[PDB]
Design a protein around this ligand. Structure first.
Ligand code: NA
Ligand code: NA
Lengths: 333, 333, 333, 333
């Protein structure tokens, strides 16, 4: 039995979900809520659905199950609430808002709506990382002791974006912070170091173009996250899980398996994927297939609204540690 | 203008094409034919299309822009002819036929209509293999001197399939023989060696469960093909191009980039893809897109009918060489 | 042209240096000093040198223009001093002493005669790590921005060694701290995090079995070191240099290049070397050749005494950071 | 009791054995022979041995426990005969002779003296190739079904060397043909194919600069050898053993484990070793030790005289196969 879905937003992120839905049998798109209606009808009219300007138009309906929220990160709150107060399961993108307060206000109002809200942490749904998480849980490498994550964007985003980014910790490291919890949910301490090695731009906005985070798990686990705002070879996304009986790591993905060998060098492979949509193509699809299972059930979604709350809390904690030169205790006593 | 496609065969390959046609935005599947009606109806409704059991019912339509032939080999000459006689382009799974004489007869009846036939040698459309071909053509490694291909199927097909497959050369090596021509169009000599090392079943049909082929190109190029009818770690599909200035080789593909390291061994990766449909997912989609563009251009197809004829002739030359213990010259003096 | 050398100690490290000295055509061992003279006699007799018990006997000689301290830590500060007196070039092993005061006290005595002392930080001489250092210095990857070092010993050392080791930072991490300086000589800040996840024995000795160090270089370089007291697959010794124009990394080393592929896993390689002596065979040899070329030049050494001092200081700095949970500034204002 | 060795040849190969004899604790080099006395003297002097110009001067001594023949092929038969008739064990480099008749003449003359001849097919002693041979023998990958060997020399040897080399099969493939027997002793058929794609010099001497060989084993095993007289990235020496339960392959060797990653390509490794002395360092040393052991045991050597015989008979068969474009049956009925 198929299910209907409503698609908020129509920007870069909106095209992905829309298209993946059509490919999935158990789902069908029907509308798009975006102020820039001209850019909302270049996606709605696309898959065979209608398009509006304001959200209220959609919130003034009565034939939609899933709510794939895909608009700016500072509007999500105002869109998740009105989906909970209508008992319709939703799936959002960037973790709630950038302001922790607004986020808490959202939790309270929706009370336990955090059950009906699956977050868009697509990395958990990547086959490679998901496999490592599952295999680790299956005790394949003994007790998890160390988790190393290396993430480097190809280059800094446009100046305008950096201004409303919320800082590297809230804008970038946050995805890594969530991945950490995916493996070790109970983080007790946060230590972070920030630097400025190449971006003059990022520098004046008093943000970092490079950081390293070390988290402590409730059982002695050390999660080490390395970040950088640029990377000449592509979108570096590695992860290493080290345990008592072995190690599991994920390599980067290249478009082909071709390798060149000549007088200058051997084993020359392609640069790795330079765009997050490419690298995580399968992930978004799997995430959607999971959003479908949680609807056919109703037990709740994972990652949920709460996961996003803590992720942001981890990011702010990282920022405080970086500015203070000391380890931050997440929850005292 | 969306192109209308008729599909023959509701089998496994049929499922791939149907799903790819749906996904392709320039195409639309309007009818599926398969004597096994329930099978066709099942696939048709899953793609919003009609289902018929006979080709007569297909050709009764007057809106067919293109045809995909994914039905049994014994139906290839018939479907190709009917489609071409009606000026309808046809993408046909290899081979044209197992009998070179029937292939010749067909070529005569259709005459110039042969230009509307595209042969489904999907491996040419594999990103990795296609990249290697284009980069070699671009002189990246100088003059091509050797081409080493290693293809090993996971296991022998079912008995009934083996019975009418026409032998390892016409059924399996044929794909490698075409890949060879993709790189070196002009082959002058053929040498082949067959053996029987594990399969009682393959030996029962007077066929080989493993062969080695060495082709001589018009300029001294040596193409070396290695085949086996079983492979414990998956569907082995490697290719190496060696030239005067370097080598380009393609590795196998795995479902994840995960590697395990413990006391037993390091760099442990997943077994490689086991099914052709998975290994060549991208290839089939790229092949379909090329078919669509050929329908729009009317400028012909590649691989073409002729590539299908020569591929079979090379396979026949292989069998003859293997049975005689000598090299076979394709074009006498 | 040759140079006489005198080794102190006949333990594991002693054997290694002796053979290397004999191996190097420009050198030749003459005597070995060790309180367990029985072995000293045995070993020497296998090279072509005499055997004594205490340093006094070695100091009752007048034919020593090369010194090597393979003897235990307790005798390091002792021999270095008693050797600079006669002004003879020397090469000591691991850390001058675990006690920084003793080091300062030693530095205060030899005063300027520290320029003749070389430190046995063999890793700097490994062909792989050294190549990376030199290539980075040659601007091959632009400006160095990140350095990630992952070291993991196969298993903990005997209970007695752990008791008198001086902690993971002084005993293990110190090698990585020097490697960090080999790349970024100037370190401004230190941050360390320790934990206990598997060794009860290490826990009762108030030591850590896991630690993560992040050092801030004078120009914003972030150096990230990861350590662990056990490793199921071998002696993990990886290093990664990340710059503005690329990245250089070193893999672990295996005894053979054999790879196995089957139904369980593909690309299975051998477990990596599990003994530091095997892994750094080439390093120790290069370390010696550099020592010799230094003596046959009288231009000092590298690594030198000052490097060992700073190394212990970083170690102590790390410990200080781990216990307080705060970043430590090496030189205030 | 240190065995005394006499070395014939002060050239490239002679230099390697000499250095290894010195290094080896169970051996002592007492005399080197070479018509070019200056080289023999120069080398001997660097090994505390004596230098003479003729074999007579070597056989005038009565203390020789073993002989190593590293002199030109034209002297192999003479030196093997003289040594064996005097009861002296002899390790001889590839080819007893290039002429199978002279080889047979030698065998007829020395009779049971052949048991004192070890053939220097050093590749069997490579740790990697040897490990694979042993693991296959231990049934690790089931029944051996295919063996693929790819050998590419960095470049053609000097003209004069090529002039008296006896062709690519006798000079180059012979090592691969021996490797084949190391895995499958019983070969029943030979098929070979040669081409001329780059070297005017090789074509000038009616030789091939490129060959592909396929051997049939007594149980249907297929051994496939690929050769080329040039290779831009180094000395390509790969081997792949494919069995019913898996596969074992050996990768090429590089000087370091360094890999570069930038905008052009990722995983860039060093060019592989370009000199056989570098690639087979461990093998030559292991081969010498095996020679030393055989001298003490008196049980015989492996590879033995017959291996040298059959390896040549196989090379001749390959040439005959290539010239006639027909498969050759090794043992007619
Ligand atoms: Na479509
Ligand atoms: Na020796």
């Amino acid at each position: 039995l198929t299910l209907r879905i409503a698609l908020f937003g129509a920007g870069r992120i909106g095209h992905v979900h829309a298209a993946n839905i059509a490919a999935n049998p158990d789902l069908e798109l029907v509308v798009i809520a975006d102020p820039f209606i001209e850019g909302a009808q270049r996606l709605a009219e696309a898959n065979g659905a209608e398009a509006v300007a304001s959200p209220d138009e959609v919130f003034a309906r009565d034939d939609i199950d899933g709510i794939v929220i895909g608009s700016p990160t500072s509007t999500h709150v105002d869109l998740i609430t009105r989906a909970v107060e209508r008992g319709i399961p939703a799936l959002c993108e960037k973790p709630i808002d950038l302001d922790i307060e607004m986020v808490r206000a959202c939790k309270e109002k929706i009370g336990d709506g955090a059950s009906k809200v699956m977050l868009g942490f697509n990395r958990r749904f990547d086959p490679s990382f998901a496999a490592i998480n599952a295999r680790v849980a299956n005790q394949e490498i003994g007790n998890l002791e160390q988790l190393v994550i290396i993430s480097r964007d190809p280059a800094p985003a446009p100046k305008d974006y950096i201004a409303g980014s919320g800082g590297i910790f809230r804008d970038m490291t946050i995805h890594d912070l969530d991945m950490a919890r995916f493996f070790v949910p109970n983080i007790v301490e946060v230590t972070a170091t920030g630097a400025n090695v190449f971006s003059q731009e990022i520098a004046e906005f008093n943000d970092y173009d490079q950081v390293i985070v070390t988290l402590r798990g409730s059982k002695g686990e050390l999660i080490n996250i390395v970040n950088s705002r640029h990377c000449s070879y592509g979108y570096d996304q590695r992860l290493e899980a080290f345990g008592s009986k072995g190690m599991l790591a994920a390599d980067n993905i290249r478009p082909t398996t071709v390798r060149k060998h000549n007088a200058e060098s051997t084993e020359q492979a392609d640069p790795i994927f330079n765009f997050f949509l490419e690298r995580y193509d399968a992930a978004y699809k799997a995430e959607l297939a999971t959003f479908a299972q949680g609807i056919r059930d109703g037990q709740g979604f994972s990652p949920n609204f709460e996961d996003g709350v803590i992720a942001l809390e981890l990011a702010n904690a990282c920022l405080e540690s970086a500015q203070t030169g000391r380890t931050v205790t997440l929850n005292p006593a």
